[PDB]
Amino acid sequence: RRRIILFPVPFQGHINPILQLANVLYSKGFSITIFHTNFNKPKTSNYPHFTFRFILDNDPQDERISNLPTHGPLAGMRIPIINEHGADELRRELELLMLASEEDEEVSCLITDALWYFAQSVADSLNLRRLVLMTSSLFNFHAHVSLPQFDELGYLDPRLEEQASGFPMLKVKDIKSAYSNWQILKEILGKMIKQTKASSGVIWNSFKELEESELETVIREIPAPSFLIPLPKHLTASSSSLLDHDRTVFQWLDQQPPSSVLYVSFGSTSEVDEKDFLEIARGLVDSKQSFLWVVRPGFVKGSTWVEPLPDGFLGERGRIVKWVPQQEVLAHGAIGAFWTHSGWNSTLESVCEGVPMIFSDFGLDQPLNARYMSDVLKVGVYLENGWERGEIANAIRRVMVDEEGEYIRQNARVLKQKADVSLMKGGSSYESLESLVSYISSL
Ligand SMILES: C[C@@H]1C[C@@]23CC[C@H]4[C@@](C)(CCC[C@@]4(C)C(=O)O)[C@@H]2CC[C@]1(O[C@@H]1O[C@H](CO)[C@@H](O)[C@@H](O[C@@H]2O[C@@H](CO)[C@@H](O)[C@@H](O)[C@@H]2O)[C@H]1O[C@H]1O[C@@H](CO)[C@H](O)[C@H](O)[C@@H]1O)C3
């Protein structure tokens, strides 16, 4: 028997695909151990078939992460901090596990988030193969490796509406938004790319017919074999949710006509002004469409939840909730469209459920996802110029009601079908998974 160790980054958009992958590999006969921080841990009782080992932030907590806040932008500093100081502990934990292994059981490989670049040298030092799971798109990676030219052309220094050079898919504004925090980002992205290239293999949460134009960059830039597997088509991430589900939404969805509901969610970490939260509310009401709006407590700066919102302002058409099983909501027949912040997991879930999108973005890979989905695949409409009630309502009605938006709704249905076909015998994702399992088994 063969065991796989997976090591996720402890945030919702990173824990979800890694535990989806773990379940896919378990279904192929591998045993599974998950290394995880105590911070943002998932419910281990949801995974009785996995062994969990909590590392790196056991108390006594290191002076470096002990004081760090658990929410907000600062919470993510754990990532560079662990990258720079976690190697010795990670090596100890891997050796302990390999020493306690049964005789009929070998550890085939370690799979980490690509952001754990420090894990490559640890795994090398144990003669352990490391595979990398990319939680962002191939298009995003193509932009990463093109950063030399970007800085060179002056894109990275504060021409906004012009097509970027040798990247006609993007506007300069997209690059400026995506790489706005350069000094801090440049080092992380450089190290992540370098150690991804040195890995034994790269698993992408995508499928070939989604990102066909980007396959050549990956083959040329990454010498290790790449595997494209659309995880949401195998299973939802419901079991790895870090917050409790409000499942009362399904009884409400069951009262809505098919394709009549706009689902609205801006992810697991974004936050907005009070000024913008109220403009978003006014756009929603102005569209005259039914909506289900997930608002994380903490989404609005300066309020605990939605205190700025007058009582009854959503009316008959709208409901606001703290958190849902998102892919299961997207699969419900009532859903007509998805207003997303363009996180990659949300984007791919909406594609795999065939739901057209309205795109906003909060930086990082989000503006690139929004531009690729709206202009290359044409499965949504991109609100690329702030929050304005009038523009919001027009975008919503264009995707959900206007005859002019029919091609977008049709494109989303066709793309879902292409994803389903990729999982059949002979399809691209079926063959990638088949190859991934035989590759891991040969290690
Ligand atoms: C590893 C990065 C370093 C860091 C932490 C510190 C830093 C930064 C945030 C930037 C500046 C402020 C500061 C200080 C501050 O934390 O607020 C600075 C950038 C980002 C850092 O990682 C981010 O940590 C967030 C939690 O704080 C997560 O929610 C992650 O992302 C979430 O899930 C994804 C699904 O794959 C996305 O789809 C994404 O939409 C979604 O937000 C991850 O985003 C992406 O960063 C992309 C930037 O290029 C990468 O390409 C990766 O692919 C990576 O996925 C955190």
Ligand SMILES: O=c1ccn([C@@H]2O[C@H](COP(=O)(O)OP(=O)(O)O)[C@@H](O)[C@H]2O)c(=O)[nH]1
């Ligand atoms: O109410 C919600 C909102 C989102 N999610 C899940 O949280 C993840 C968000 O990841 P994404 O990459 O889209 O954005 P991030 O939060 O990392 O910015 C996705 O898997 C969603 O299905 C959820 O389960 N319920």
